[PDB]
């Protein structure tokens, strides 16, 4: 049961995958976004992910299919485990901290190229201890908010 607000957010997410703007997500487009953030799914794995969401079996995900799967499968909140996995992806050297560079890396690959001041403001919003980086607990707060 999605609100206008949620639809707008999902449209933006769908659009990142749908890089050619044709209103469908292919295996290729899904693979591209995944690899761009450090995932290494095999082709068969990608194909399964598509087939899972592709209700009409025509081989691509369209927006109605995407929204329907969101309404059927999404959680109310980001789960604890999803937050731990996402922290891993941001903290790609595994040093325990998300740095401005690691944050910029993720944001650019989510289709948002930010200035240094904007990256720094993002960090500032999360940065409880004022050290200039986002640790695990600070990241949890930003994800549960």
């Amino acid at each position: 049961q999605l609100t206008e607000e949620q639809i707008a957010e999902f449209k933006e997410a769908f659009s990142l995958f749908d890089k050619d703007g044709d209103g469908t997500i292919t295996t290729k487009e899904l693979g591209t976004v995944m690899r761009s953030l450090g995932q290494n799914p095999t082709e068969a794995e990608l194909q399964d992910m598509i087939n899972e969401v592709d209700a009409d079996g025509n081989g691509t995900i369209d927006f109605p299919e995407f929204l329907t799967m969101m309404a059927r499968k999404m959680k109310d909140t980001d789960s604890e485990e999803e937050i731990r996995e996402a922290f891993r992806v941001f903290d790609k050297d595994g040093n325990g901290y998300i740095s401005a560079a690691e944050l910029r890396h993720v944001m650019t690959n989510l289709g948002e190229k930010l200035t240094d001041e904007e990256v720094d403001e993002m960090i500032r919003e999360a940065d409880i201890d004022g050290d200039g980086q986002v640790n695990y607990e600070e990241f949890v707060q930003m994800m549960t908010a």
Binding site: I25, E82, M107, E112, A126
Partner: peptide, 19 residues
């Protein structure tokens, strides 16, 4: 804001790139 976009991408079932 920008954090919201991360929240949305993290909570995508099936195809989230953050698994």
């Amino acid at each position: 804001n920008h954090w919201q976009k991360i929240r949305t991408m993290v909570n995508l079932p099936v195809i989230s790139p953050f698994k």
